[PDB]
Amino acid sequence: CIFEVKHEGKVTGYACLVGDKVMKPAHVKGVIDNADLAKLAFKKSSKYDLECAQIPVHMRSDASKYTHEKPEGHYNWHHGAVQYSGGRFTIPTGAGKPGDSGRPIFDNKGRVVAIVLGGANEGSRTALSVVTWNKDMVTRVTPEGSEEW
Amino acid sequence: CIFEVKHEGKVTGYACLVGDKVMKPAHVKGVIDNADLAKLAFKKSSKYDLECAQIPVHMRSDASKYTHEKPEGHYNWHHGAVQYSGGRFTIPTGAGKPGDSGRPIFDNKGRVVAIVLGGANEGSRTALSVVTWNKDMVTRVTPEGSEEW
């Protein structure tokens, strides 16, 4: 699902294929390093800090599944754990540096629970700025003091 | 499920009620700080570092559920996360100190995936010594260099 969004040879973020759409955080500079993906029609929402595009048939096989079911607990991500509690995601400060946008936070079954956009460093823990689902609805949760990765 | 095992006023470990049995790591000094539980008939296995006892009817309501289904990913415990990969559990060195025996490591649905007995500190991560299930069996996984908590 993850596809890197390069900008002049520099990887600036990522793009996941979640369900039937190809998502990419709007704020991220660059183009997707996948020929077929670059060529698609992207719709951009500044409200959600997103920029999605409906996936082509031949790539739908490599499309991940998403979910609203996000009980309190622990989730997985590129840089380990993500504590989830109080409708808030968190990672130990320093696991996520800039360039970590578009990465998914998934459950133990593979389902993508949310997509990182950036994070608010609040001591030992950084409260993540994310794109999350809501009974078939894409919401966006963002903490005060948030940077964009 | 967690019930503390005291020894002369000093809490030395814990005892969880998993399913229909009351488990307690054999190595732990002391008695269970619950009248009813102390009075039961305990069977001890030195093989599994366990000492279980079949739960009384009135306590079965407070009995937790267990499971063998443990896919790679992240789990929950008293001291945050537990990385689980390679049939191995791990926590960031320092989260688990002695006195943490008998604590359960559970999934996001509550099910108890394993019970801590101790751990081998191997740098930034400590590989936990645990009691885990296995398709209607109770196994014991323990790493070299393991202390007993």
UniProtKB/Swiss-Prot annotation, chains A, B:
Quote the entry's note on domains: The N-terminus contains a nuclear localization signal and a CRM1-mediated nuclear export signal. The C-terminus functions as a protease during translation to cleave itself from the translating structural polyprotein.
Q: What are the annotated disulfide bridges?
A: C1-C16
Which residues does the UniProt site feature Involved in dimerization of the capsid protein point to? Y75, N108
Q: What is this protein called?
A: Capsid protein
Q: Where is this motif: Nuclear export signal?
A: 32-42
Q: What is the effect of changing W149 to A/R?
A: Complete loss of cleavage by capsid protease
What does the record give as the function of this protein?
Answer: Forms an icosahedral capsid with a T=4 symmetry composed of 240 copies of the capsid protein surrounded by a lipid membrane through which penetrate 80 spikes composed of trimers of E1-E2 heterodimers. The capsid protein binds to the viral RNA genome at a site adjacent to a ribosome binding site for viral genome translation following genome release. Possesses a protease activity that results in its autocatalytic cleavage from the nascent structural protein.
- Print the organism lineage: Viruses, Riboviria, Orthornavirae, Kitrinoviricota, Alsuviricetes
User: What organism, scientifically named, is this protein from?
Assistant: Semliki forest virus (SFV)
**Quaternary structure per UniProt?**
Homodimer. Homomultimer. Interacts with host karyopherin KPNA4; this interaction allows the nuclear import of the viral capsid protein. Interacts with spike glycoprotein E2. Interacts with host IRAK1; the interaction leads to inhibition of IRAK1-dependent signaling.
